[PDB]
DNA sequence: GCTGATGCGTC
DNA sequence: GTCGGAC
DNA sequence: GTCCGACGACGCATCAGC
């Protein structure tokens with residue numbers, strides 16, 4: 001209706017027609033989306049965020065149904081279905097250059113302000129064409145992603161500058177955040193799905209305008225309304241988990257409604273699905289708690305990458321990553337061995353496996369780092385140098401039957417009976433069915449001796465299905481580095497700090513750490529650190545370290561190719577840091593030359609544990625000790 | 635034709 | 646990937 | 653328990669600059 005500047009989607013008793021800031025048939029203004037984002041970031045209760053987004057979506061459904069799909073993508077900061085692999089090719093680098101040119105400022109002034117403010121959007125905002133539309137912005141995002149080849153970056157920057165030129169009010173803030181891949185509203189995929197099912201439930205699509213039914217919940221008690229919306233939410237959520245593709249779902253949702261959705265969109269080979277995830281567990285006793293009276297199995301947790309393998313009726317094979325990226329082209333070796341792993345009675349399947357690097361000469365697992373050296377796309381079978389062994393642990397679909405609602409006890413049995421193991425090519429995950437604490441503890445220890453991270457734990461019959469909408473983190477993961485007093489901890493020196501973002505703007509969000517090389521009496525950067533501290537600890541760090549800020553680095557500190565810290569720090573603080581493994585680093589100088597001529601050592605999954613108030617830098621972990629820790633990984 | 639910086643996926 | 650915090 | 657924002661190392665693929 002009126003100026004989108006005053007649009008209030010957090011309004012109590014929000015009316016999808018009377019409270020919209022645009023007219024029926026009008027394109028949804030982008031400022032309407034931005035104002036919704038603003039009202040979402042103002043609150044901390046997710047349910048209030050969902051309500052606010054639901055209000056916007058109800059207006060879109062009632063007034064401008066063609067804009068529902070772009071509005072949803074803008075709210076997710078997605079470009080399209082993940083298996084299509086669309087990429088902006090735009091990060092803070094390209095974006096800050098576009099802002100500098102748009103605002104006519106020096107790139108270094110923009111870069112410094114962005115770091116101080118903790119957000120690129122704030123610089124673009126505080127620094128004539130028609131108003132932007134939601135579908136117009138989304139299409140320009142897609143134009144950026146389709147630009148390739150030489151001189152393509154300059155063309156991307158041209159589009160970004162044109163967007164910023166047309167921005168009003170808060171629009172530039174959220175364009176910049178979206179382009180940088182850091183929307184971070186506090187509302188993401190789960191809340192967007194909750195808002196969508198609520199929106200189409202309360203304001204059914206496909207009504208003749210003006211819609212006779214703008215609030216289908218008004219005739220229900222609060223109790224009945226909540227039960228109804230929860231059921232509708234599960235329909236949408238479970239369908240999406242099986243078909244996480246809005247290009248497919250939304251046209252069906254608009255035409256046939258949410259109740260008929262499962263009839264049109266069903267799990268099928270060749271369409272990636274969401275994978276089942278795992279919740280961390282701190283000890284074997286904790287496991288026995290959450291699985292008190294439910295039989296469960298323990299499996300080795302292999303150190304590779306997830307490979308969801310689809311065999312379609314007719315013989316076509318597709319492979320997808322855990323985030324639904326198409327990996328078919330990177331695994332020609334897997335595609336060729338499918339006839340060898342499945343019995344001839346199998347006509348279609350979806351397998352859940354871990355692809356692990358495998359040394360055929362030595363017949364043993366290789367580290368994850370080796371696996372990542374494989375090529376990623378347009379790979380021909382003859383050129384493969386790092387061989388892969390598949391460790392299969394689940395079966396989601398078989399001979400036309402979805403197993404999503406079947407217990408693991410049955411899925412595992414169909415897996416074990418219809419597929420064939422070959423050493424070093426296709427194996428079932430090593431497993432143990434027991435409830436004895438002593439056998440589990442020995443099994444955990446043996447998993448690490450056999451080159452694995454620890455154990456996966458899964459119920460066999462109680463809440464043991466593959467229904468992600470019911471619970472996405474339905475499995476438990478028990479890694480040895482979760483256990484207190486177990487795993488590698490290091491005492492490292494804080495040599496630099498990185499300015500924080502969003503909530504921590506003006507404070508520190510990360511730090512640069514170093515080990516002490518006795519042979520050269522130098523502090524060598526080993527890794528950055530940005531997790532493990534409580535909010536109180538991170539605030540105290542910002543306080544205690546202010547007295548250490550240096551204008552210039554000490555001459556005995558070496559960081560080589562590490563990211564230069566925003567603030568150098570006088571080497572003094574020593575922190576205890578835990579990691580899962582030590583890796584061979586091309587960038588960090590710590591211990592460079594002690595295990596490899598050109599590469600130093602860094603930490604895998606580093607996290608802060610506590611301050612070592614009783615240690616000075618000269619008693620910190622030495623580069624020689626780092627090298628020793630790396631070697632003992634064998 | 636090559637190198638290094640950047641982007642974005644893996645874990 | 647790990648972690649902490651609001652709900 | 654759920655969800656989400658904070659942050660980590662690392663590789664290939666790509667393209668700007670040379």
Ligand SMILES: *OP(=O)(O)OC[C@H]1O[C@@H](n2cnc3c(N)ncnc32)[C@H](O)[C@@H]1O
Pocket residue numbers: 277278279299300301302303304305306307322353354393429456477
């Ligand atoms: O730490 P995390 O949540 O990413 O762990 C889950 C991942 O672990 C991998 N994995 C390895 N071995 C298994 C088994 N046996 N079962 C399930 N997952 C397993 C997967 O890649 C998973 O995403």
Ligand code: NA
Pocket residue numbers: none
């Ligand atoms: Na990243």
